[PDB]
């Protein structure tokens, strides 16, 4: 129904002890991250907030994070998902602390929402009160800064950032262009926390607007 | 069946009147853009020519203009579709002058063709007599010019565009390489409006002979 | 089941006796190229694989050769599948010969294997003793030198490649940087002959203990 999360699901987890120098000259690893962390979900921005968020509680970095075409629905085999994540860190201790805390994230009820009866809209919406190394890089930010993470499908969400950078004292920081892998679209917008938060709150708004009325104008 | 028209449709529309001017900086807007009419429908180069059409009767320019990954059969939204397209104008009320043309001509019977029975195949075989401001640009030809619209499946287009180059005096403006985001192809040519419709008769005529016969000379 | 071949399957074939001079521009075509082969497959990297084999056999060249986006599981029509390749020679046998041993290759055996009981997760993992000129020059290498060709989902692929590197005296040559078109991954590694075989060993080996274990210290 209309306000119901999607509950975002992890599908795969290893660790790489001691990475090859090849594999580390290709993922221009720092000298002395010899361990990596590989994680697939069935959620892309979830999943790249929870990447973010580990990089806070754990020695980690995250050095690749991807989306799959055409999302997590149309994906062809058991593990692929719709997104595929890296940390790297000194060692499989750091790089294990760095996957739980993804996974927790994953799995404390942060998710896409539900716009309409047969949840056929969805939208992200979701105020980072402290960002991780990730995310502030990704939207050229101080870390720590807050920042609004707002995605949508095309229409709804050019429609709805329009409304969010209004509504709020917030600057656009990265334009996720429609259409993403996942065909979807959205922005980083950061300002203060409750500038943020205000901006999360019209970002909604306006995509439950256009799911009330798709086609009047 | 074969020769079926597939209806094209749109799923959603809005205008945004006073355009935020970061948003006006990530679209690249020219300063006199103050309104968007946003639309998203089913079917992508049907929309790009409507959009185009739009172009020539209101004060409207073509600033955005995309197609989803993998078609709307694999969408994942109800409004996603698999194109996103983005009119800019001086006021909502000229904006919503340019939309109404846009859904007009999406209405009109433009649209892909069947090339067989069960509709697993399909192309747009559509001669633009009298193109626009954006066909025209994206083309490198002058606004008003002609084109043949020529989009089908990636081997298809590739044997039916060289059917329709050898069939009519046209010449190779837009070439689409396979795939685009929607795992088509094609191109625009152009040239007089009768070498235009000699070509998408040859197009057309191509696409259907392939679905006929896929595995060629085995 | 597990270990088993996954059939590849061509899904159409045509061949181009005289390319038109527009098609040939677009497609790059050399002054002695007059004909081109045009095929598609529901899985891409056997179909490259199958293409440059077609180069040792026949005189023809590898012009065209991409992926559709989200694989053939996708595909929205009849014979898009996830792949098309264009061989180009300098008259129709040539193209003809090469379309045969194109085929020939397809159906030799080759292909992704299954990694566990119910087919969801499967990899390639093929060596290459000699490369022709399509591989090769993908690779930055010399034809006739070996390659081993190793692709797999996202994060098998990652850890798998990883296992393969340290396994064997290889070089990296090209990556294939998660997603694919298809949302698979892997990479192109040169080096002697066993050495690439050593590498191909470790790499499905590596793929199926993933799929024994996804979730892994979890
Ligand atoms: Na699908």
Redesign the interface.
Known sequence: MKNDLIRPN???????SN??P??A??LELEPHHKS?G???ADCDDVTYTALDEATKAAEVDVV?A??????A????????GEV?G?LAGPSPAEV?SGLNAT?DFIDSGVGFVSA?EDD???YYAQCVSRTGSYLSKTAGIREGEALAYLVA????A??A??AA??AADV??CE?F???T???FAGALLTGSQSACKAACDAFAEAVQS?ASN??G?
Do not use: H, Q, W
């Not at 991807?66 to 999302?71: D, K, T, V």
């Open positions: 992890v599908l795969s987890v290893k660790i790489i990475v090859s090849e594999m000259k290709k990596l590989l994680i697939t690749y991807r989306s799959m075409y055409a999302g629905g149309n994906a062809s085999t058991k593990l692929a595929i890296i294990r996974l309409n056929s809209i969805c499908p095309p229409l709804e050019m429609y950032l329009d950078l209004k600057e656009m334009f262009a429609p259409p892998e996942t065909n256009v798709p086609l104008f």
